[PDB]
Amino acid sequence: MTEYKLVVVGACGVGKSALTIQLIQNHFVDEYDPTIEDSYRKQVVIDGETSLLDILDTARDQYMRTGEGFLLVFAINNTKSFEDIHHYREQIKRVKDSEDVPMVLVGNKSDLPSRTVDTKQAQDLARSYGIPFIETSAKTRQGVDDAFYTLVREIRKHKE
């Protein structure tokens, strides 16, 4: 019965869309229009509780204001995208007017061998933020459920 508005943010090309589509449609899209910004709905069950997810895949001022949780996505083979995380976080903090916003740090493209962002680096950032860090591959589906479900768990602990 509960609904959760989730927002997926991060630099262009990190796999925001691919991640969202795997969760929604259960397949990996190789070439999804980089400019398309849209929301996707799905009824899920998480730790036994039924819930409707409304997920904005950015590429809206509305979702920022009404978003209850955010995935901060970088790709592990894109140092610049990891360096952009702080900016995304501060922007959310500003709009939401809080310092306790539910967020999850997501390191995507974990199947790729060209790693330039150490796991240690990401974990150290997430620790400073007090948020979970989850490694994912939209391509193999590794960690996809875990990223979204973890965010939902962070939302629930926050409003409780």
Q: Kindly list the residues in this chain that would bind Mg ion in the complex (CB under 5 A).
A: 16-17, 59
Nearest distance from residue 34's CB to Mg ion, in Å?
Answer: 6
Task: Kindly tell me which residue out of 111, 116, 127, 158 binds ligand GDP, with binding defined by CB under 6 A.
Answer: 111
Query: Is residue 103 helix, strand or coil?
Result: strand
Q: Is 25 in the site for ligand GDP (CB under 6 A)?
A: no
Q: Are strands 103-108 and 69-75 parallel, antiparallel or unpaired?
A: parallel
User: C-beta of 120: minimal distance to ligand GDP in Å?
Assistant: 20
- Which does residue 12 touch among Mg ion, ligand GDP, none (CB within 5 to 8 A, set by kind)? ligand GDP
Using rule CB under 6 A, residue 38 touches ligand GDP:
no
Is 109 a binding residue for ligand GDP by CB under 6 A? The answer is yes
Assess 129 for contact with ligand GDP (CB under 6 A): no
Q: Closest separation between CB of residue 159 and Mg ion, Å?
A: 28
Q: What is the pattern of x (binds ligand GDP, CB under 6 A) and - over residues 52-91?
A: -------x--------------------------------
User: CB of 102 within 8 A of CB of 156?
Assistant: no
Identify the CA nearest to 94 among candidates 120, 119, 124, 64.
64
Q: Residue 112's CB: how many other CB atoms inside 10 A?
A: 13
| CA 140-143-148 angle, 5° bins | 125
Nearer to Mg ion, 51 or 70 (CB): 70
Helix segments in the chain, DSSP class H: 16-25, 61-66, 79-83, 85-96, 119-129, 144-158
**What's 55's DSSP letter?**
E
**Is 35 strand, coil or helix?**
coil
Residues contributing to the site for ligand GDP (CB under 6 A):
10, 12-18, 30-32, 34, 59, 108-109, 111-112, 137-139
